[PDB]
Amino acid sequence: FRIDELEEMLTNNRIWRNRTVDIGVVTAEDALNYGFSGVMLRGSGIQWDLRKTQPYDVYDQVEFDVPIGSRGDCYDRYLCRVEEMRQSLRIISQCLNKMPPGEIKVDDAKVSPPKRAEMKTSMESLIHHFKLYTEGYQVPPGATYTAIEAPKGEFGVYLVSDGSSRPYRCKIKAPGFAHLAGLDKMSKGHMLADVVAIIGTQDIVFGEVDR
Amino acid sequence: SNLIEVFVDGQSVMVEPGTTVLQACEKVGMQIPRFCYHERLSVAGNCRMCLVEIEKAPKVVAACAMPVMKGWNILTNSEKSKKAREGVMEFLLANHPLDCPICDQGGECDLQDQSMMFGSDRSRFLEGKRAVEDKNIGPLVKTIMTRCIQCTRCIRFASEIAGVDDLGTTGRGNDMQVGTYIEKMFMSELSGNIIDICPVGALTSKPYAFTARPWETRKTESIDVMDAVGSNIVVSTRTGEVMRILPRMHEDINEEWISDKTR
Amino acid sequence: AGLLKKTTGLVGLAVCETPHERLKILYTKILDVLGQIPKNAAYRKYTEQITNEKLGMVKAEPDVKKLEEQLQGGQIEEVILQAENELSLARKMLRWKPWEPLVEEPPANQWKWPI
Amino acid sequence: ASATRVIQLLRNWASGRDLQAKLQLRYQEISKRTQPPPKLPVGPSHKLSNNYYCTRDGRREAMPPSIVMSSQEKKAVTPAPPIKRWELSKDQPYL
Amino acid sequence: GTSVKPIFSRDMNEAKRRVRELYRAWYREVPNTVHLFQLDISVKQGRDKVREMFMKNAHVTDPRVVDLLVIKGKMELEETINVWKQRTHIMRFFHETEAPRPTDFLSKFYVGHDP
Amino acid sequence: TYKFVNMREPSMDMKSVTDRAAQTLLWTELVRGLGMTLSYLFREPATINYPFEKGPLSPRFRGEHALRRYPSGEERCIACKLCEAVCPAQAITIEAEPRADGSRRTTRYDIDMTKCIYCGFCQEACPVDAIVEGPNFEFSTETHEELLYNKEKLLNNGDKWEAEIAANIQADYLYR
Amino acid sequence: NEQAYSLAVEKLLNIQPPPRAQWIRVLFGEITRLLNHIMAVTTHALDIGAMTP
Amino acid sequence: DTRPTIRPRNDVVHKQLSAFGQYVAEILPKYVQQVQVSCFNELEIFIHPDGVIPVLTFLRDHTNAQFKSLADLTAVDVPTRQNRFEIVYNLLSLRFNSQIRVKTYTDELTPIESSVTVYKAANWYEREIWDMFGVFFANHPDLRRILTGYGFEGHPFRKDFPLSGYVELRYDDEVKRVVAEPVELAQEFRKFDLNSPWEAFPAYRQPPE
Amino acid sequence: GVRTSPTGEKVTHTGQAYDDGDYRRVRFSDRQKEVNENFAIDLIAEQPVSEVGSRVISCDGGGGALGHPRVYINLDKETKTGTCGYCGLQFRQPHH
Amino acid sequence: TQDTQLIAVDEKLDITTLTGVPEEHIKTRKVRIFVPARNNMQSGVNNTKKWKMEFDTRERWENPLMGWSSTADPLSNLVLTFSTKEDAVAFAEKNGWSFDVEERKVPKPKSKSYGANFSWNKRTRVSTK
Ligand code: SF4
Ligand code: SF4
Numbered sequence A: 001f002r003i004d005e006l007e008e009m010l011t012n013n014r015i016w017r018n019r020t021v022d023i024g025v026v027t028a029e030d031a032l033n034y035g036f037s038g039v040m041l042r043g044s045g046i047q048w049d050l051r052k053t054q055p056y057d058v059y060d061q062v063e064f065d066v067p068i069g070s071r072g073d074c075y076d077r078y079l080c081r082v083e084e085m086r087q088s089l090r091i092i093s094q095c096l097n098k099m100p101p102g103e104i105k106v107d108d109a110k111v112s113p114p115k116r117a118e119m120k121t122s123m124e125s126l127i128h129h130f131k132l133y134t135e136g137y138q139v140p141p142g143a144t145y146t147a148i149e150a151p152k153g154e155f156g157v158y159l160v161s162d163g164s165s166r167p168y169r170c171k172i173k174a175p176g177f178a179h180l181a182g183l184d185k186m187s188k189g190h191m192l193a194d195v196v197a198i199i200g201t202q203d204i205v206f207g208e209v210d211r
Numbered sequence B: 001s002n003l004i005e006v007f008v009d010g011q012s013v014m015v016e017p018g019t020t021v022l023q024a025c026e027k028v029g030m031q032i033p034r035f036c037y038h039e040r041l042s043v044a045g046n047c048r049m050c051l052v053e054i055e056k057a058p059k060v061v062a063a064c065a066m067p068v069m070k071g072w073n074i075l076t077n078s079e080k081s082k083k084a085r086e087g088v089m090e091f092l093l094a095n096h097p098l099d100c101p102i103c104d105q106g107g108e109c110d111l112q113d114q115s116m117m118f119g120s121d122r123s124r125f126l127e128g129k130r131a132v133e134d135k136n137i138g139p140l141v142k143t144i145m146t147r148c149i150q151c152t153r154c155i156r157f158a159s160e161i162a163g164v165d166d167l168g169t170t171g172r173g174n175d176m177q178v179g180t181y182i183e184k185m186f187m188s189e190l191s192g193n194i195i196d197i198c199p200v201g202a203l204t205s206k207p208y209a210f211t212a213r214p215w216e217t218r219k220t221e222s223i224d225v226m227d228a229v230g231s232n233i234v235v236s237t238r239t240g241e242v243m244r245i246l247p248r249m250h251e252d253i254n255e256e257w258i259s260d261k262t263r
Numbered sequence C: 001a002g003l004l005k006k007t008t009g010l011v012g013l014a015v016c017e018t019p020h021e022r023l024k025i026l027y028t029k030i031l032d033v034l035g036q037i038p039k040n041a042a043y044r045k046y047t048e049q050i051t052n053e054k055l056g057m058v059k060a061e062p063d064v065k066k067l068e069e070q071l072q073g074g075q076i077e078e079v080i081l082q083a084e085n086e087l088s089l090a091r092k093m094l095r096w097k098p099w100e101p102l103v104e105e106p107p108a109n110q111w112k113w114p115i
Numbered sequence D: 001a002s003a004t005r006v007i008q009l010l011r012n013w014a015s016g017r018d019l020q021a022k023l024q025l026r027y028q029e030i031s032k033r034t035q036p037p038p039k040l041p042v043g044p045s046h047k048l049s050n051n052y053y054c055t056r057d058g059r060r061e062a063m064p065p066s067i068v069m070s071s072q073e074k075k076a077v078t079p080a081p082p083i084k085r086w087e088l089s090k091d092q093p094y095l
Numbered sequence E: 001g002t003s004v005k006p007i008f009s010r011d012m013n014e015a016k017r018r019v020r021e022l023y024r025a026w027y028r029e030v031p032n033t034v035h036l037f038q039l040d041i042s043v044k045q046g047r048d049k050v051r052e053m054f055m056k057n058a059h060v061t062d063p064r065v066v067d068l069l070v071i072k073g074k075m076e077l078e079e080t081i082n083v084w085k086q087r088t089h090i091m092r093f094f095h096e097t098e099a100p101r102p103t104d105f106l107s108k109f110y111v112g113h114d115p
Numbered sequence F: 001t002y003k004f005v006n007m008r009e010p011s012m013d014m015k016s017v018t019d020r021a022a023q024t025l026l027w028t029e030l031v032r033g034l035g036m037t038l039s040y041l042f043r044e045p046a047t048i049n050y051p052f053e054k055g056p057l058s059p060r061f062r063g064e065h066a067l068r069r070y071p072s073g074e075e076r077c078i079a080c081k082l083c084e085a086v087c088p089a090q091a092i093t094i095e096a097e098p099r100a101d102g103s104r105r106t107t108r109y110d111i112d113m114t115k116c117i118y119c120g121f122c123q124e125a126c127p128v129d130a131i132v133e134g135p136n137f138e139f140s141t142e143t144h145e146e147l148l149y150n151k152e153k154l155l156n157n158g159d160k161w162e163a164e165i166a167a168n169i170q171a172d173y174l175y176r
Numbered sequence G: 001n002e003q004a005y006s007l008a009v010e011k012l013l014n015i016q017p018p019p020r021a022q023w024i025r026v027l028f029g030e031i032t033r034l035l036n037h038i039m040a041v042t043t044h045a046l047d048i049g050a051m052t053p
Numbered sequence H: 001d002t003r004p005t006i007r008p009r010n011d012v013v014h015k016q017l018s019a020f021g022q023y024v025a026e027i028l029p030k031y032v033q034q035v036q037v038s039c040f041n042e043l044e045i046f047i048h049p050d051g052v053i054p055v056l057t058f059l060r061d062h063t064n065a066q067f068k069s070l071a072d073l074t075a076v077d078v079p080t081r082q083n084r085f086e087i088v089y090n091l092l093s094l095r096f097n098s099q100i101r102v103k104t105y106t107d108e109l110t111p112i113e114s115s116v117t118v119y120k121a122a123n124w125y126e127r128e129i130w131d132m133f134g135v136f137f138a139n140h141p142d143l144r145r146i147l148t149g150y151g152f153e154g155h156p157f158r159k160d161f162p163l164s165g166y167v168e169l170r171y172d173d174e175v176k177r178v179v180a181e182p183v184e185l186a187q188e189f190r191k192f193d194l195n196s197p198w199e200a201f202p203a204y205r206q207p208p209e
Numbered sequence I: 001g002v003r004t005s006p007t008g009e010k011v012t013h014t015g016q017a018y019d020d021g022d023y024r025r026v027r028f029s030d031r032q033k034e035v036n037e038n039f040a041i042d043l044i045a046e047q048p049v050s051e052v053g054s055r056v057i058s059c060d061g062g063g064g065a066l067g068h069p070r071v072y073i074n075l076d077k078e079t080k081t082g083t084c085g086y087c088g089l090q091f092r093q094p095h096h
Numbered sequence J: 001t002q003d004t005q006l007i008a009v010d011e012k013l014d015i016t017t018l019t020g021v022p023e024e025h026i027k028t029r030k031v032r033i034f035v036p037a038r039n040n041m042q043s044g045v046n047n048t049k050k051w052k053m054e055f056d057t058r059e060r061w062e063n064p065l066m067g068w069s070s071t072a073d074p075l076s077n078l079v080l081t082f083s084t085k086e087d088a089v090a091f092a093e094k095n096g097w098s099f100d101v102e103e104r105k106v107p108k109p110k111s112k113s114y115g116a117n118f119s120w121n122k123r124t125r126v127s128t129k
């Protein structure tokens, strides 16, 4: 119900249209090759989503439809944003009605802290909890980048493990940095009062870029 | 020559005969688990944590005192070896008191660290744990003997390195204690090293007790000036001050032990 | 066959009313530049395999829709654009000649983890 | 919600929608702030038998990155079968 | 052994050539930056401050490192003229606030027990 | 699966163009905005009357710290030093030396509020639930020095927010 | 963001989350999606000059 | 999954990217020193410094790779090796839903020709590496400082720049501006020497020296 | 139990006492020193000593999971009545 | 093998002026390359397998307010570990720190004999068990 008014007085408002359509228009190949992620791909007509193409976690069981549009301007991405909230509502529904029973943490004391009740009765629980909060679990060497479909876009972390209980280096890949990397073209062909709308649709937040 | 070759987990080593498995696995760089064995000290073969599996062996063999010869392919990551380590360790851990937050060995405890590399994640224990009284053999050594694992390292250290024959294991069964029976005042000038050989917090330095934890003490390698040997020592530093002194290794100098007033 | 594609579904990527013929002429074009590179190169050993392969599918079946499934490349405009950069990729490694062995072996401990 | 019927009928006209059915301010239908104690389920490996760590040591059952070649008819192999079209939204295809 | 790849230099000659018009650009840079950024320090003060910074990077004898100092050197002048930097940035090299670290043995000995 | 958003193919019939022309000529989508906003006006607000009433919280709420004590008044802290071993901002500093009755309990427990993150790792790290995240949050001060807590400040808050914290930890130990 | 870091460390550790915990994460993962898009559309509208949304 | 604790492993993905690793190896064996698949099913390509443009262009337009989504570019700086800066790219292909990692090596002085021709996404994934690490990429449109203070010296994310840095800011009355000074800490960042003295994983054991 | 310093600064359980010449005591002037009057040192001096009888006592700390990790305390040293290290509660045997 | 306007410099590699370290932190420092000494309490030696480089301890003064560990030595947090020592010398010289060396002390082989504990005339006959 609360979404409707957000749609009613913005989607139909000709004022919102002329202030959000035909701005920040990004062609498909430029979006893909500028490193853009998430909605810019979805907005510009490109059929791609991490949550569906490589469904992580348990997104397998859930079913829904991502809103790829036609033009890809800031207006089109706005419908993609609004429709994603509607889509997210159903995804909430599907996990809600069939939440499985079971434990909240992996039954691996070497990686998950033992339960408080188990902590004060089991000698192993004390040892495992003790060292887990001093140095933590030792992660075997290797490196991964695995990313998820964050609502900002393709958000991934690239950590390298030294074979100890501490990371060596975790590059903070962020959709916003890729998002903003094409800002030069993005504001091209438009004036200040509407490229600020381009800033809004880009979903830039200065904690993913600047870290 | 007499040098005899052994299939150490595959790879072959021409080890010198009479060398035990522990004195062979380190050749390639494999550190066998241990609690009762000490390289600088004698061998007892009691804690049963070095226990490893020999190929085609009916039972896992105590790698602590296994004189090795030709063939005899050892297995590091075998299921039977893991079975032995898993069982034995929770046998140590069975009656061990839940003292890690109050024990100074916390963060520098073998029994703590060995239990996170080759050890279970929970216990099937639902009975009680044996408890033994403390002892008072010095204003430097502090005895929480319920934490003792009866590895007898202190006894062999006392009667072979310090030359004092007063430590021992009184009793039998399971309630026996590694104590001194008659009340005693540990007099040896190498008494401070008794702290650094016990793998648990059963024997601990009284002055340093409840003063610092291992993960915050920056270690600096330095020397001793108390004696004219220049003992290679480790100086623990934290917040512009020193807490406790550890012995380094150089063989000709202090080796692995330091005298008391040095510590 | 089929009526003209109203929109390819990808902005910037326009429509082409001559799907099969444009694919073919571009395809012989990449066949042309494949000649200059030696046959023994694994490049030429692999591209001509897929050259003669999917040049047959475009030639045999002329319909837009059946060609889409047979090549799993979305709309034809995507495929010919995809084949277009294949041509440019062919030109670049024409002058590159990356067929000789490694330029030089890596340093002794340059790789291998942990340090 | 409080509001008499004249207020409710007025906004239902201006909105054109039934605001009374679902309001945006929570009422007594929410769960009681105090709730009964929980009894969360036991661990999936809580069995005290046949549960040795040698059979489920996840961190220890990782191998180093497998090498296939080093400096020191061949079918065209693709890293994955090329992805296809998905579907057109049986529930609601076009807004 | 000594085989290294260039970026801008082969011989110290051209390496010293790059720092030449780098000085030239910086030499003509002082008159505008002081006036436009509204400082108090004098024009010749800036010119010698540019000058001395050259002398700090003078003991290196590798064409390979100087250009890295050149690109770092050329990474600052545009940041000044295009009002990218600020007063706290360009007066920072005019090291002013900090007390003068003692240089003789006694004065260092008196201040503290550090080298 | 996916669905389109922008495409509409507005029909060019005489009736349909009339609605579009009417919408432009006599504004209708804009008056819709007025109708929605006016309907919003005739609705009671959601504002809360602070401090006369403050918004809801949870038994797990993480706020100002407090060092708790046993039923008889003993400090639960034992300087096991786990809390700063996991304190992500290193806001906890602890020292311990002998206590009079043979004990060697702590002397220093300073959690710098201006360094602390309120993640709650400390209370989970504590094996004797000594340090906890209290429910209080109204401890704003006008001096940076006030937020720098010490052992006595922590213990006083433990005696101040005691009954509330004890009930919360009694209502939450099953979850933990 | 917790989701990305978690599965990343899960991937290196070769440990998979329990099935129950997997379903809670997507519940809050989509709540963040609700969180983000609500901020995204309105701040855009705030930048334009729309206040009520 | 009979072992819910462990992460289930897949083999159909394992061998396929293993085969594709050979595929790329044969196509241009001039630059690929070695290819390493992962237990995480993330195959990685190890290339030569001059090989940045060829392989990156190759995965971009090839009909069997189509890797055209630049995920990230970063450095994994390793002091113990002569090429401390380890430049690594991550590529994504929408058509075949796979992720390719290409890894290089570089000293502080050796350059790398810019990949802006391959991906214009690198434009800013190039600037910060030059700032954060100090390695300079040749023929790039701009090498500006993007993630540091104006006039900042050194390169922070190196394993040489300390956590606290060298310079600290403060607003001073005499100058009426926020001026700099050598760093001074109320608290020294304490050390947590937490690496256990017991071996963790026999599988990844370093070969004896 | 708290004892007052000559300058009036109530000393804490750790024993801290800013002297007359300590210039930093000015932080306390025009303000108040914060002291927890409840001195945990002496709250066990008066605590009753349990006459529970067995060779080993399971001291859990009361409140079940709300206390401290339960420890086994041995009662064989008749000179020293056993005290839980976590608790400080005093336990003695019924004269063995 | 390779040449692109090849540069040939014999000067020992030195960044120093480009790495941005200050002068007093490049002239008045001391770096002792060594193998971490294992804590004698822990029998395991999974720390004597690397080469750690750090600098000299500097002044540490208690903060007047509350008793912190206030210091002004930025160059004390570096615990750089090396696979070997020949790279450690390389790292020391490329920055030009005051190089120092410590030799990677080797465990003297301690050939044991459980049967020696039960001798017949040797003092190795153990009186402890
Ligand atoms: S000896 Fe080790 S396991 Fe026992 S209480 Fe002390 S730290 Fe814990
Ligand atoms: S007191 Fe310590 S050294 Fe002696 S047997 Fe017990 S655990 Fe071993």
Ligand code: SF4
Pocket (backbone or CB within 6 Å): B101, F076, F077, F078, F079, F080, F081, F082, F083, F084, F094, F125, F126, F127, F128, F129, F130, F131
């Ligand atoms: S608060 Fe808890 S974890 Fe922290 S030192 Fe005290 S007892 Fe240990």
Ligand code: SF4
Pocket (backbone or CB within 6 Å): F083, F086, F087, F088, F089, F090, F091, F092, F111, F115, F116, F117, F118, F119, F120, F121, F122, F123
């Ligand atoms: S809540 Fe604060 S004090 Fe506790 S661990 Fe987190 S940051 Fe440290």
Ligand code: FES
Pocket (backbone or CB within 6 Å): B033, B034, B035, B036, B037, B044, B045, B046, B047, B048, B049, B050, B051, B062, B063, B064, B065
């Ligand atoms: S190691 Fe051989 S028994 Fe202790």
Ligand SMILES: [K+]
Pocket (backbone or CB within 6 Å): B105, B195, B196, B197, B198, B199, B200, B201, B202, B203, B204, J041
């Ligand atoms: K000990």
Ligand SMILES: [Zn+2]
Pocket (backbone or CB within 6 Å): I059, I060, I061, I068, I071, I084, I085, I086, I087, I088, I089
């Ligand atoms: Zn107790």
